[model samples]
Target: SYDIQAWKKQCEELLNLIFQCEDSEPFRQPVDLLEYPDYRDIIDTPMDFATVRETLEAGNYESPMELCKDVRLIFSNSKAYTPSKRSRIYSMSLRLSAFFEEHISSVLSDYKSALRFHKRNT
Candidate 1:
């Protein structure tokens, strides 16, 4: 009832959605410490799509929700570090975060339902 390969494919599709976004450029890679020296002090756990994809490629994700958590951190970290709500990057965080949640929420629900069904039968 649950398959990692199929789930990973679904994850790739979700990732592609973010990748194709024009506003996703900033979150594609880690913040350059030289560009923003204090970024490390402000954001404890840095996350980016590049690293997230690498983690996926490494087959490090043990569950469907693990990738989602890391992906969400990309936006949440932005919100924490940007400071100004009016900043473009700040807006990008809100926009992209909502877009991801909209799509991934359904994916998560389906995952749980299928798991529940799998558990019930056996």
Candidate 2:
């Protein structure tokens, strides 16, 4: 049946949004780009994300890699990082950066090599 005009229109709109989001500067930059001291990126996040939840549940902040694992699981299950999850990831990155800044003598302990995907994006 060719009676799906509305659905087609919605599909087109979705395509446009996908294209726009993919081309947006936030998505274009490297995941670690925001960590640079010279630049700041404005991104979105969820009010209640798993990483934040874990941190709160643990009663203290934790290693970035720990948060990274939670984030990767979310991304893997969804196949894409949504604005909300991305926000949580961004917060984790900030927390990690702060950890490095504050603990100069601390050694990097969370070195899980499994994080790097087998087939990376670009």
Candidate 3:
């Protein structure tokens, strides 16, 4: 009952897509404060993100680590970094790859069983 050709084609296409995405540039890179040399004045200052976020709700801070943390928090709140879109896509790709692997195994098993049972393809 299996549509072998259709499954094979889908598996091929999905694998190709996975490979393409792997070859593509990464969606995001780690935020390194040192990378922004122009913002040395902001990066060198000392500040706390929690203390500032408490009373003012929104305010500017000069500390690099604090700023980085706040920026990370923003991304976290937006679901942009933690379980990020890139990570989600990567996870989906892995799952799709696994699905095709399982399907291929099942097809091979069925084919072997048919041969063992002396079943002829029509």
The lDDT leader among the candidates is 1
- The model with the greater lDDT, 1 or 2, is 1
State the C-alpha lDDT per candidate: 0.85, 0.35, 0.38
Per-residue lDDT over 1-122 for candidate 1, one digit per residue giving the tens place of the 0 to 100 score = 45424667788888888999988889999999999999998999999999998898899997669999998889889989986899998898888888888888867776777777778868
- Candidate 1: RMSD to truth: 1.6
Model 2, which residues run further than 4 Å from truth? 1-61, 80-122
Error of 2 at 96 (Å): 18
Tens-digit lDDT track of model 3 for 1-122: 43323333443443345345442122123233475444334334322223324322333432223333542433333233233455654454345435445544654554445444554543
Better of 1 and 3 by TM-score: 1
Comparison by TM-score, 2 against 3, better one: 3
lDDT of 1: 0.85
C-alpha-based local distance difference test score of model 2: 0.35
lDDT winner between 2 and 3, please give it: 3
What is the TM-score of each predicted model, taking all chains together?
0.91, 0.23, 0.24
Query: If both were scored by lDDT, which would come out higher, candidate 1 or candidate 3?
Result: 1
Query: What ranking emerges by lDDT with the best candidate at the front?
Result: 1, 3, 2
